[PDB]
């Protein structure tokens, strides 16, 4: 059974790797440096871009919400 | 082990045949053909006086079984508990068997019906309904036993030995009969289920559907001689007629639980009688003259006014009552179970309806052929 | 080296739960498939093996795959809680076999017959007749309680490939204490 | 089908990637596998071209 | 006549009214709709047999036959 758990970990490592690769190729550059203006609750924030345009984000995105602060 | 089944080999018709026949299987590490005979040998006609021996034998066999069905275990420990007849430990004992097989197999309900079976005789109400609800909530993701239902229904049939379990019993009594289909029980077992059901149906407060009166394989097929009046009375309610000679003729029988509710039952028949008439109505003449309703139910005109008042109150009609003319205009939203002749009749009307719908379609397509485009 | 897709049919019926074989039948099948699946991939690295449960239904738990991890992993939670149906098992194994991703591999099937098979003798032979026409070699190995070397089963292997056929063996394992060693000695290295 | 006709039957989306619409965006592993799996279902067509949107820019390259 | 889709689910119930249990496929109402993007493609895709949305007397009557 130890081998079976190892097989599950090995599969998880490839999928974790595959998800990581898709996120890695979608991180890319350049980033528009914006300024989070607030956080409406109803996981979605109201970014006010540095280009002087505001853009509500349905999903805050590739970050942990709790980390993001007004 | 082998000696124990040798010493307690007695108590079974064909001592060597009853026990040592299966002993050959256990030696070759198999555990299926034993129990069925064990259940069969516990189903074998006996007082089960070897229960203590069989208990130990089952306990011994079950102690190092680790394969036999907990249904037989319960079916044998219940046969045990029905044979040890010691409810004090039965709850305690059935619980330990339950805990000893704690996988998803639904043996606790049977133990709950074992607490059912023995706590439905000792402390039969306080938490038994919980002993049901826990089963009902748990009894999901797997409708394969069909006994989890029955004992609750039976315990609700035992709980049918309570105030507010008649319609719940009839609704559940019908439910159970579907789960187990074949005879697979004495004609007495089946005919008993039909009688307590019909007697419940005629008594149930919230049930006047009576759909399975003729379509239920058991109640319809069974009970052709033994108190067949029920099928007549049950067939009576689908007709609503006065029939009060029968209700009296069946009153000679089933004196208990029917005389005590003749006032309720008479009200029920009166109630269905209205639905019967407005069904028999020619549809267009959906109105019902006060006299016709009062004559069918032999109820005086002063109370046909209130009879419709009820029947329309529960939800068995969606009409309106007139008094200047006293014709109760009728509009139905409460359908009834059907019959071959009823359906044959219902289809013959529908053939006419499609004939008219076809005719008017032709009279439009032909007329507007140029414009039809 | 012989390019072949091994569509192993592992039993999971209820009788598969009584361990006439020391620890249990299932481990015997679970140990047995461990060697047959590993035996095939070792023989040829371009091979592929899948498994079909045969009790209560014909589930296709793992389609025809080369990677042996999936077959081994899927073996777990095989939960022997059904009734064998060998009449259909071979067909579904063959019909799934017909979907061989590569069209070159020879055909070789391993059936784990561990329960009494309730199949008309006429039906089994007709199934064998269909196999002969389509050139599939299937090996039958019996476990646990069963009418020893069932006449219906034995007729199956004989008509499977006779008249100096490949010899798709009806390897009968000695009931009682015995590992896949019998299953690995004869059938696994020569089918 | 011939010189005077280029027939396109099915299209399969190549996953959006940070590169954009460029040669690099064509993931050889995604395309080789997807083609392989569409061949079993009964669509053994050949890669006849590529398409990319142009959010409002027009129909130009 | 129309509606080339029929949608079914899986339910396993005791059939309340005292009848054997079984698998059966219950029915779920089906309706064919279009999101914006496909709608634009579809509307052009026909572009030769589409009926006028106004209806007019000719098409309204045909709606009744």
XYZ file of C-alpha atoms in Angstrom:
760
model
C 0.000 0.000 0.000
C 3.051 2.279 0.549
C 3.684 2.073 -3.234
C 0.019 3.039 -3.919
C 0.318 6.250 -1.788
C 3.590 6.959 -3.632
C 1.759 6.551 -6.974
C -0.915 9.056 -5.854
C 1.829 11.508 -4.778
C 3.671 10.983 -8.089
C 0.472 11.759 -10.069
C -0.227 14.756 -7.814
C 3.320 16.017 -8.426
C 2.778 15.998 -12.226
C -0.646 17.766 -12.029
C 0.675 20.259 -9.424
C 3.549 20.748 -11.882
C 1.148 21.081 -14.877
C -1.065 23.628 -13.054
C 2.116 25.424 -11.960
C 3.383 25.483 -15.597
C 0.062 26.920 -16.914
C 0.163 29.605 -14.162
C 3.925 30.085 -14.944
C 3.303 30.707 -18.695
C 0.336 32.943 -17.784
C 2.300 35.041 -15.285
C 4.520 36.455 -18.029
C 5.275 40.181 -18.258
C 4.757 43.133 -18.224
C 2.371 43.916 -15.359
C 0.334 47.092 -15.152
C 1.020 48.389 -11.659
C -2.380 49.311 -10.280
C -3.622 50.499 -6.894
C -6.293 48.478 -5.088
C -8.896 51.060 -4.092
C -11.217 48.867 -2.032
C -12.558 45.337 -1.589
C -16.267 44.750 -2.057
C -17.446 41.454 -0.562
C -20.621 40.792 -2.565
C -13.205 37.876 -3.411
C -13.622 40.814 -5.782
C -11.796 44.130 -5.571
C -11.994 47.477 -7.341
C -8.617 48.117 -8.939
C -7.919 51.676 -10.044
C -5.297 51.200 -12.727
C -2.292 53.488 -12.945
C -3.625 54.484 -16.369
C -6.395 56.346 -14.522
C -9.072 53.721 -15.183
C -10.928 51.665 -12.581
C -11.657 47.984 -13.160
C -13.688 45.832 -10.789
C -12.232 42.338 -10.632
C -14.764 39.503 -10.294
C -11.963 37.310 -8.967
C -9.057 38.974 -7.175
C -6.864 36.556 -9.062
C -3.586 34.759 -8.490
C -3.228 35.991 -4.913
C -4.645 35.201 -1.473
C -7.461 37.636 -0.742
C -6.537 38.027 2.926
C -3.104 39.279 1.874
C -4.552 42.001 -0.357
C -5.507 45.096 1.616
C -7.024 48.450 0.635
C -14.492 -25.322 17.484
C -15.431 -28.542 15.678
C -16.163 -30.214 19.005
C -18.470 -27.386 20.066
C -20.655 -27.848 16.997
C -20.423 -31.554 17.842
C -21.672 -31.088 21.411
C -24.333 -28.491 20.560
C -25.042 -30.378 17.320
C -28.448 -31.197 18.833
C -31.612 -29.033 18.611
C -31.633 -29.264 14.802
C -33.627 -31.794 12.771
C -30.897 -34.120 11.578
C -28.251 -33.198 14.168
C -25.371 -34.243 11.874
C -27.338 -32.939 8.902
C -28.179 -29.599 10.535
C -24.667 -28.748 11.667
C -21.883 -31.012 10.406
C -23.065 -30.477 6.828
C -21.883 -26.866 7.011
C -18.846 -27.773 9.130
C -17.221 -29.098 5.963
C -17.431 -25.593 4.512
C -15.849 -23.759 7.451
C -12.831 -26.062 7.344
C -12.269 -24.891 3.759
C -12.479 -21.248 4.832
C -15.835 -20.314 3.275
C -18.620 -18.378 4.976
C -21.729 -17.967 2.779
C -23.538 -21.294 2.347
C -23.308 -21.686 6.121
C -25.380 -18.692 7.193
C -28.245 -19.161 4.731
C -28.631 -22.624 6.205
C -27.916 -21.027 9.583
C -30.689 -18.557 8.820
C -32.547 -21.439 7.184
C -31.727 -23.639 10.171
C -32.762 -20.684 12.300
C -35.610 -20.328 9.833
C -35.823 -24.106 10.241
C -39.029 -24.783 12.199
C -37.784 -24.954 15.773
C -38.328 -23.312 19.123
C -34.709 -22.183 18.674
C -34.126 -23.522 22.188
C -30.575 -24.102 20.996
C -30.507 -20.318 20.806
C -28.116 -20.253 23.752
C -26.181 -23.004 22.005
C -26.849 -21.410 18.617
C -26.127 -18.002 20.144
C -22.823 -19.399 21.389
C -22.647 -21.445 18.189
C -23.519 -18.313 16.247
C -21.420 -16.323 18.712
C -18.623 -18.879 18.410
C -19.236 -19.124 14.673
C -19.718 -15.358 14.488
C -16.793 -14.775 16.860
C -14.413 -16.262 14.276
C -16.709 -15.842 11.298
C -15.595 -12.406 10.020
C -17.543 -13.175 6.845
C -21.184 -14.016 7.659
C -23.931 -11.507 6.895
C -24.900 -9.148 9.742
C -28.409 -9.625 8.402
C -28.228 -13.269 9.481
C -26.360 -12.108 12.573
C -29.215 -9.718 13.272
C -31.605 -12.212 11.692
C -30.119 -14.838 13.986
C -29.452 -12.585 16.974
C -32.971 -11.256 16.441
C -34.015 -14.883 16.171
C -31.648 -15.100 19.122
C -33.125 -11.988 20.733
C -36.550 -13.267 19.739
C -35.300 -16.541 21.227
C -33.131 -15.316 24.107
C -36.066 -12.959 24.749
C -33.827 -10.833 26.983
C -34.393 -7.248 25.820
C -32.258 -5.903 28.657
C -29.021 -6.924 26.911
C -30.514 -7.094 23.406
C -30.107 -3.347 22.999
C -26.671 -3.621 24.580
C -25.912 -6.768 22.602
C -27.223 -5.553 19.248
C -25.186 -2.381 19.710
C -21.932 -4.301 20.124
C -22.625 -6.269 16.936
C -23.403 -2.981 15.209
C -20.182 -1.378 16.434
C -18.249 -4.514 15.466
C -19.334 -3.977 11.841
C -19.315 -0.184 11.556
C -18.884 0.077 7.792
C -21.719 1.442 5.655
C -23.725 -1.793 5.965
C -27.082 -0.739 7.365
C -27.404 -3.209 10.243
C -27.914 -0.616 12.996
C -31.443 0.172 11.803
C -32.242 -3.505 12.258
C -30.533 -3.002 15.612
C -32.475 0.264 15.714
C -35.371 -1.996 14.834
C -33.691 -4.320 17.300
C -33.895 -1.466 19.741
C -37.008 -1.085 17.664
C -38.027 -4.714 18.175
C -37.181 -4.662 21.878
C -37.432 -0.949 22.640
C -40.669 -0.894 20.657
C -41.807 -3.100 23.537
C -39.723 -1.321 26.206
C -39.584 2.471 26.021
C -41.345 2.588 22.688
C -41.806 6.265 21.921
C -39.332 8.736 23.416
C -36.379 8.099 21.084
C -37.667 5.341 18.795
C -38.890 8.023 16.389
C -35.297 9.210 16.598
C -34.326 5.578 16.057
C -36.386 6.023 12.892
C -35.256 9.494 11.844
C -31.589 8.584 12.244
C -32.265 5.613 9.974
C -34.215 7.732 7.496
C -31.478 10.365 7.324
C -28.779 7.691 7.157
C -30.811 5.521 4.760
C -29.571 7.398 1.719
C -27.146 6.608 -1.100
C -28.240 2.954 -1.012
C -31.838 1.702 -1.470
C -30.812 -1.971 -1.508
C -31.948 -3.529 1.789
C -35.673 -2.624 1.879
C -35.929 -3.892 5.450
C -34.617 -0.599 6.849
C -37.882 0.793 5.553
C -40.144 -2.031 6.699
C -39.294 -2.065 10.396
C -39.753 1.704 10.549
C -42.977 1.177 8.633
C -43.582 -1.800 10.920
C -42.361 0.256 13.877
C -44.519 2.994 12.407
C -46.963 0.115 12.076
C -46.074 -0.434 15.702
C -46.097 3.350 15.803
C -49.351 2.714 13.962
C -50.117 1.672 17.531
C -49.951 5.397 18.282
C -52.272 8.363 17.872
C -50.952 10.135 14.786
C -49.886 7.167 12.652
C -52.659 6.103 10.316
C -52.006 7.926 7.042
C -48.293 7.802 7.759
C -48.852 4.078 8.153
C -50.884 3.718 4.964
C -48.406 5.803 2.981
C -45.534 3.771 4.425
C -47.471 0.504 4.283
C -47.866 0.982 0.534
C -44.208 1.977 0.308
C -42.984 -1.240 1.880
C -44.968 -3.584 -0.337
C -43.057 -2.279 -3.338
C -39.673 -3.025 -1.806
C -40.353 -6.761 -1.346
C -42.475 -8.149 -4.157
C -42.781 -11.956 -4.211
C -44.732 -13.941 -1.650
C -41.465 -14.413 0.289
C -43.674 -14.567 3.404
C -46.774 -16.537 4.433
C -50.058 -15.777 2.736
C -50.895 -14.883 6.332
C -48.050 -12.370 6.250
C -49.336 -10.821 3.026
C -53.033 -10.880 3.886
C -52.191 -9.383 7.263
C -50.415 -6.499 5.542
C -53.436 -5.865 3.310
C -55.972 -5.892 6.140
C -54.089 -3.517 8.425
C -53.482 -1.357 5.363
C -57.032 -1.206 4.056
C -58.348 -0.900 7.594
C -55.856 1.938 7.889
C -56.756 3.460 4.535
C -60.442 3.547 5.399
C -59.354 5.067 8.717
C -56.506 7.373 7.679
C -57.330 11.056 8.068
C -55.224 12.363 5.201
C -55.819 9.508 2.739
C -58.832 9.152 0.477
C -56.852 8.395 -2.667
C -57.263 4.608 -2.314
C -55.426 4.297 -5.612
C -53.842 0.927 -4.863
C -57.191 -0.589 -3.840
C -57.394 -2.413 -7.158
C -53.847 -1.925 -8.477
C -51.912 -3.179 -5.452
C -50.858 -6.763 -6.198
C -51.242 -7.854 -2.570
C -54.445 -6.229 -1.356
C -56.166 -6.708 -4.709
C -54.995 -10.279 -5.302
C -54.879 -11.398 -1.684
C -57.890 -11.533 0.633
C -60.397 -13.182 -1.663
C -62.090 -15.109 1.155
C -60.632 -14.102 4.515
C -62.659 -11.029 5.421
C -63.155 -10.123 1.765
C -65.586 -7.426 2.889
C -62.614 -5.048 2.988
C -62.072 -5.317 -0.757
C -65.771 -4.581 -1.196
C -65.714 -1.684 1.269
C -62.395 -0.522 -0.168
C -63.921 -0.855 -3.630
C -66.949 0.908 -2.157
C -64.990 4.049 -1.312
C -63.871 4.318 -4.931
C -67.607 4.428 -5.726
C -68.853 6.499 -2.782
C -72.315 4.941 -2.895
C -74.442 4.682 0.241
C -73.743 0.937 0.616
C -74.568 1.384 4.301
C -76.009 -2.129 4.394
C -72.507 -3.423 3.641
C -70.830 -1.058 6.101
C -73.386 -2.585 8.440
C -72.855 -6.054 6.958
C -69.120 -5.552 7.348
C -70.075 -3.928 10.657
C -70.973 -7.423 11.843
C -67.307 -8.106 11.165
C -64.377 -5.868 12.064
C -66.393 -4.546 15.016
C -63.262 -2.997 16.605
C -61.680 0.080 15.007
C -64.563 0.483 12.525
C -67.572 1.147 14.745
C -65.422 3.554 16.751
C -64.956 5.581 13.553
C -68.247 5.127 11.686
C -68.862 8.839 12.221
C -65.512 9.632 10.612
C -65.887 6.927 7.969
C -69.401 8.068 7.051
C -68.018 11.579 6.647
C -65.284 10.192 4.394
C -67.729 8.348 2.143
C -69.893 11.453 1.974
C -66.780 13.398 0.995
C -65.743 10.952 -1.717
C -69.383 10.628 -2.783
C -69.244 14.233 -3.984
C -66.044 13.606 -5.945
C -67.718 10.468 -7.300
C -70.750 12.374 -8.541
C -68.857 15.277 -10.071
C -66.765 12.677 -11.879
C -69.913 10.882 -13.068
C -71.256 14.293 -14.121
C -71.457 14.706 -17.903
C -68.705 17.329 -17.618
C -70.694 20.130 -19.255
C -73.386 19.737 -16.589
C -70.694 20.089 -13.944
C -73.248 21.727 -11.656
C -74.838 19.411 -9.105
C -78.407 20.010 -8.000
C -78.757 19.899 -4.227
C -81.291 17.103 -4.543
C -78.951 14.847 -6.501
C -76.149 15.195 -3.951
C -78.541 14.740 -1.033
C -80.091 11.674 -2.653
C -76.786 9.934 -3.416
C -75.425 10.291 0.124
C -78.913 10.099 1.668
C -77.970 13.293 3.521
C -80.557 15.989 4.116
C -80.340 19.133 2.026
C -79.375 21.235 5.032
C -76.043 19.390 5.290
C -75.116 18.905 1.643
C -74.315 22.585 2.072
C -71.707 21.737 4.704
C -70.498 18.465 3.174
C -69.283 20.335 0.101
C -68.008 22.914 2.581
C -65.620 20.339 4.007
C -64.651 18.454 0.843
C -63.758 21.814 -0.659
C -61.917 22.764 2.528
C -59.285 20.006 2.607
C -58.480 20.491 -1.070
C -60.526 17.814 -2.821
C -62.245 20.380 -5.063
C -61.850 23.905 -6.391
C -65.477 24.853 -7.063
C -67.971 27.307 -5.601
C -71.272 26.929 -3.754
C -74.559 28.571 -4.729
C -77.560 28.789 -2.420
C -80.246 30.738 -4.288
C -80.322 27.780 -6.676
C -78.272 25.544 -4.329
C -76.381 23.993 -7.251
C -72.724 23.593 -6.280
C -70.721 24.669 -9.309
C -67.764 22.307 -9.516
C -64.232 22.729 -10.826
C -61.713 19.994 -10.098
C -57.997 20.061 -9.337
C -57.945 16.761 -7.419
C -57.663 13.731 -9.742
C -58.313 10.103 -8.856
C -56.687 6.813 -9.847
C -58.016 5.286 -13.057
C -59.218 1.946 -14.418
C -59.123 0.067 -17.719
C -62.718 1.016 -18.525
C -62.132 4.538 -17.221
C -59.065 4.854 -19.450
C -60.838 3.198 -22.366
C -63.611 5.732 -21.860
C -61.117 8.567 -21.445
C -59.397 7.676 -24.718
C -62.655 7.433 -26.673
C -63.422 11.022 -25.702
C -59.921 12.061 -26.751
C -60.336 10.464 -30.169
C -63.296 12.791 -30.662
C -61.218 15.762 -29.514
C -58.460 15.120 -32.047
C -61.125 14.623 -34.712
C -62.331 18.179 -34.123
C -58.801 19.563 -33.825
C -57.964 17.913 -37.134
C -61.119 19.166 -38.835
C -60.541 22.791 -37.865
C -56.918 22.561 -38.984
C -58.000 21.488 -42.467
C -60.643 24.217 -42.563
C -57.866 26.734 -41.940
C -55.092 25.368 -44.144
C -57.474 24.866 -47.054
C -59.103 28.255 -46.558
C -55.886 30.283 -46.345
C -53.787 28.368 -48.864
C -52.976 31.495 -50.864
C -52.022 33.549 -47.812
C -50.518 30.619 -45.899
C -47.179 31.055 -47.690
C 8.864 -8.493 -26.675
C 5.750 -9.809 -28.419
C 3.646 -6.705 -28.946
C 0.411 -7.529 -27.166
C -2.205 -5.678 -25.155
C -3.123 -7.567 -21.989
C -6.695 -6.698 -21.002
C -6.708 -8.404 -17.608
C -10.202 -9.262 -16.363
C -10.091 -9.322 -12.559
C -13.004 -10.812 -10.659
C -14.597 -8.878 -7.820
C -17.679 -10.965 -7.015
C -18.751 -11.771 -3.468
C -17.407 -15.317 -3.552
C -14.067 -13.661 -4.356
C -14.077 -12.673 -0.671
C -13.654 -16.120 0.942
C -9.975 -16.894 1.247
C -9.494 -20.539 0.369
C -6.176 -19.062 -0.689
C -4.383 -18.170 2.514
C -4.863 -14.393 3.035
C -7.824 -13.977 0.694
C -8.827 -14.529 -2.921
C -8.648 -10.817 -3.745
C -5.031 -10.421 -2.706
C -4.435 -13.499 -4.850
C -5.972 -11.660 -7.770
C -4.419 -8.438 -6.476
C -1.067 -10.159 -6.116
C -1.639 -12.058 -9.358
C -2.384 -8.999 -11.482
C 0.678 -7.354 -9.956
C 2.785 -9.969 -11.734
C 0.786 -10.320 -14.962
C 0.660 -6.550 -15.419
C 4.339 -6.266 -14.502
C 5.179 -9.375 -16.515
C 3.816 -7.877 -19.733
C 5.473 -4.465 -19.441
C 8.822 -6.062 -18.603
C 8.543 -8.373 -21.613
C 7.948 -5.404 -23.927
C 8.148 -1.712 -22.944
C 5.678 -0.789 -25.710
C 3.007 -3.051 -24.191
C -0.130 -1.978 -22.326
C -2.514 -3.641 -19.883
C -5.992 -2.732 -18.676
C -8.377 -4.340 -16.231
C -12.113 -5.039 -16.316
C -14.040 -5.926 -13.199
C -16.467 -8.756 -13.887
C -18.990 -8.845 -11.015
C -22.509 -7.376 -11.034
C -21.616 -5.548 -14.243
C -18.763 -5.092 -16.687
C -16.966 -1.966 -15.524
C -13.907 -0.900 -17.470
C -12.099 0.545 -14.476
C -8.920 1.319 -16.435
C -8.915 1.543 -20.217
C -6.095 -0.007 -22.202
C -2.978 1.791 -20.965
C 0.769 1.073 -21.024
C 1.634 2.735 -17.702
C 1.349 0.083 -15.005
C 0.847 2.559 -12.167
C -2.746 3.301 -13.135
C -3.655 -0.395 -13.284
C -2.052 -1.093 -9.909
C -3.523 1.993 -8.262
C -6.994 1.309 -9.623
C -6.798 -2.217 -8.245
C -7.206 -0.801 -4.753
C -10.727 -0.277 -3.477
C -11.817 -3.056 -5.823
C -14.390 -3.958 -3.173
C -15.477 -7.514 -4.014
C -19.243 -6.971 -3.724
C -20.845 -8.401 -6.867
C -21.803 -11.480 -8.861
C -19.563 -12.602 -11.715
C -20.868 -12.456 -15.293
C -18.281 -14.059 -17.548
C -20.640 -14.263 -20.531
C -20.268 -10.516 -21.063
C -16.869 -9.962 -19.476
C -14.873 -11.326 -22.388
C -16.938 -9.373 -24.913
C -16.471 -6.053 -23.140
C -12.788 -6.861 -22.733
C -12.576 -7.713 -26.428
C -14.789 -4.827 -27.518
C -12.572 -2.498 -25.513
C -9.634 -4.367 -27.030
C -10.890 -3.445 -30.489
C -10.099 0.154 -29.481
C -6.391 -0.641 -29.323
C -4.634 2.678 -29.862
C -1.930 0.878 -31.796
C -3.295 -1.531 -34.384
C -0.256 -3.850 -34.460
C -0.217 -5.488 -31.025
C -1.264 -9.119 -30.885
C -4.252 -9.928 -28.716
C -3.930 -11.632 -25.330
C -6.553 -11.629 -22.565
C -6.236 -12.844 -18.959
C -9.470 -13.669 -17.125
C -9.632 -14.068 -13.341
C -12.380 -16.676 -12.943
C -12.938 -17.009 -9.213
C -16.650 -17.745 -8.880
C -19.105 -20.306 -10.251
C -20.018 -19.134 -13.742
C -23.728 -19.463 -14.538
C -23.553 -19.563 -18.331
C -25.238 -21.853 -20.826
C -22.703 -24.175 -22.420
C -24.016 -23.132 -25.838
C -23.531 -19.446 -25.051
C -19.919 -19.830 -23.945
C -18.932 -21.802 -27.042
C -20.563 -19.228 -29.317
C -18.549 -16.549 -27.521
C -15.487 -18.701 -28.134
C -16.466 -19.029 -31.793
C -16.596 -15.251 -32.170
C -13.152 -15.008 -30.562
C -11.672 -17.558 -32.960
C -12.766 -15.573 -36.006
C -11.224 -12.358 -34.665
C -7.916 -13.858 -33.475
C -7.813 -13.016 -29.774
C -5.990 -15.281 -27.322
C -7.473 -15.289 -23.818
C -6.138 -17.114 -20.760
C -8.491 -18.394 -18.063
C -7.289 -18.894 -14.485
C -9.635 -20.031 -11.723
C -9.619 -19.033 -8.050
C -11.608 -19.800 -4.919
C -14.592 -22.100 -4.671
C -15.901 -23.266 -8.039
C -16.782 -26.519 -9.772
C -13.184 -27.561 -10.292
C -12.201 -27.019 -13.929
C -15.757 -26.207 -14.930
C -16.862 -28.154 -17.991
C -18.264 -24.915 -19.408
C -14.936 -23.193 -18.780
C -12.820 -26.062 -20.102
C -14.824 -26.246 -23.320
C -14.185 -22.510 -23.645
C -10.388 -22.753 -23.701
C -10.349 -25.778 -26.004
C -12.428 -24.103 -28.715
C -10.559 -20.889 -27.917
C -7.669 -22.036 -30.119
C -7.599 -25.723 -31.022
C -6.292 -27.755 -33.940
C -2.739 -26.912 -32.869
C -3.692 -23.460 -31.626
C -1.504 -20.997 -29.778
C -2.556 -22.692 -26.547
C -4.322 -19.953 -24.616
C -4.042 -21.856 -21.374
C -6.850 -22.725 -18.988
C -4.321 -22.664 -16.158
C -6.099 -24.186 -13.158
C -4.531 -23.020 -9.900
C -4.287 -25.500 -7.011
C -6.951 -24.389 -4.528
C -5.531 -23.960 -1.066
C -2.261 -22.369 0.002
C -0.701 -21.130 -3.226
C 0.449 -17.723 -4.429
C 0.456 -16.522 -8.040
C 3.538 -18.737 -8.361
C 1.367 -21.215 -10.240
C -0.215 -18.255 -12.029
C 3.247 -16.862 -12.790
C 5.089 -20.096 -13.601
C 2.877 -21.358 -16.443
C 0.636 -18.595 -17.859
C 2.618 -15.417 -17.250
C 5.843 -16.451 -18.992
C 3.996 -18.524 -21.619
C 0.397 -17.984 -22.694
C -9.261 19.345 -51.373
C -7.450 20.925 -54.324
C -5.631 24.068 -55.377
C -8.778 26.189 -55.693
C -10.403 25.209 -52.398
C -9.198 25.012 -48.795
C -11.904 23.322 -46.755
C -11.966 23.749 -42.976
C -14.270 21.422 -41.064
C -13.441 21.679 -37.358
C -11.417 24.011 -35.172
C -9.889 23.266 -31.778
C -8.795 26.000 -29.426
C -5.185 26.149 -28.483
C -5.104 27.201 -24.841
C -4.594 30.875 -24.173
C -1.019 31.570 -23.108
C 0.946 34.641 -22.126
C 2.839 34.705 -25.413
C -0.285 35.818 -27.260
C -0.913 34.920 -30.897
C 2.521 33.770 -32.018
C 4.375 30.624 -32.992
C 5.312 30.041 -29.357
C 1.642 29.919 -28.354
C 1.308 26.712 -30.406
C 1.968 24.134 -27.701
C 3.311 21.095 -29.591
C 2.321 18.733 -26.773
C -1.258 20.032 -26.676
C -1.663 19.856 -30.445
C -0.015 16.465 -30.933
C -2.172 14.911 -28.223
C -5.445 16.597 -29.211
C -5.026 15.583 -32.842
C -4.272 12.044 -31.702
C -7.493 11.917 -29.697
C -9.681 13.480 -32.400
C -8.477 10.777 -34.789
C -10.221 8.070 -32.775
C -13.593 9.816 -32.797
C -13.680 9.952 -36.587
C -12.098 13.255 -37.547
C -8.756 12.406 -39.182
C -8.406 15.870 -40.680
C -5.131 17.701 -41.190
C -4.131 21.047 -39.718
C -5.230 23.381 -42.514
C -4.571 26.737 -40.871
C -4.784 28.887 -37.782
C -7.175 31.547 -36.565
C -6.918 34.296 -33.998
C -9.370 36.950 -32.878
C -8.595 40.685 -32.933
C -10.653 42.357 -30.166
C -12.190 45.118 -32.377
C -8.929 45.858 -34.292
C -10.363 44.619 -37.639
C -9.581 41.837 -40.155
C -5.830 42.475 -40.780
C -2.520 40.732 -39.894
C -42.134 19.611 -35.418
C -39.193 20.803 -33.359
C -37.080 20.726 -30.218
C -34.445 18.162 -31.241
C -33.246 17.784 -27.624
C -34.730 15.622 -24.852
C -33.102 15.831 -21.417
C -33.228 13.031 -18.839
C -31.969 12.495 -15.282
C -31.502 9.453 -13.045
C -33.726 8.868 -10.016
C -34.137 5.791 -7.823
C -37.274 6.131 -5.720
C -39.520 3.711 -3.862
C -42.392 4.737 -6.158
C -44.449 5.836 -3.136
C -47.457 3.963 -4.505
C -46.304 0.447 -3.689
C -44.546 -0.757 -6.837
C -41.124 -2.299 -7.538
C -38.099 -0.025 -7.439
C -35.899 0.459 -10.492
C -33.507 2.871 -12.197
C -35.660 4.640 -14.790
C -34.920 8.024 -16.404
C -36.982 10.934 -15.130
C -37.620 13.777 -17.565
C -36.336 17.356 -17.286
C -37.693 20.246 -19.332
C -35.430 21.075 -22.262
C -35.121 24.396 -24.043
C -32.753 25.558 -26.767
C -31.128 28.944 -26.231
C -28.144 30.935 -27.388
C -25.502 33.084 -25.743
C -24.536 36.288 -27.508
C -21.529 35.017 -29.446
C -23.174 31.947 -30.971
C -26.307 34.003 -31.598
C -24.466 36.313 -33.986
C -22.979 33.363 -35.834
C -26.277 31.518 -36.051
C -28.214 34.531 -37.310
C -25.792 34.989 -40.186
C -25.500 31.243 -40.628
C -29.110 31.041 -41.767
C -29.407 34.461 -43.427
C -31.356 32.815 -46.249
C -34.376 31.163 -44.591
C -34.958 33.329 -41.524
C -38.504 34.642 -41.266
C -39.205 38.302 -40.624
C -39.510 39.006 -36.901
C -42.509 41.305 -37.478
C -44.667 38.326 -38.399
C -47.151 40.090 -40.654
C -50.568 38.600 -41.366
C -49.137 35.921 -43.648
C -46.739 34.468 -41.081
C -49.030 34.918 -38.076
C -51.727 32.756 -39.662
C -49.177 30.112 -40.623
C -48.249 30.209 -36.947
C -51.754 28.910 -36.257
C -52.084 26.233 -38.929
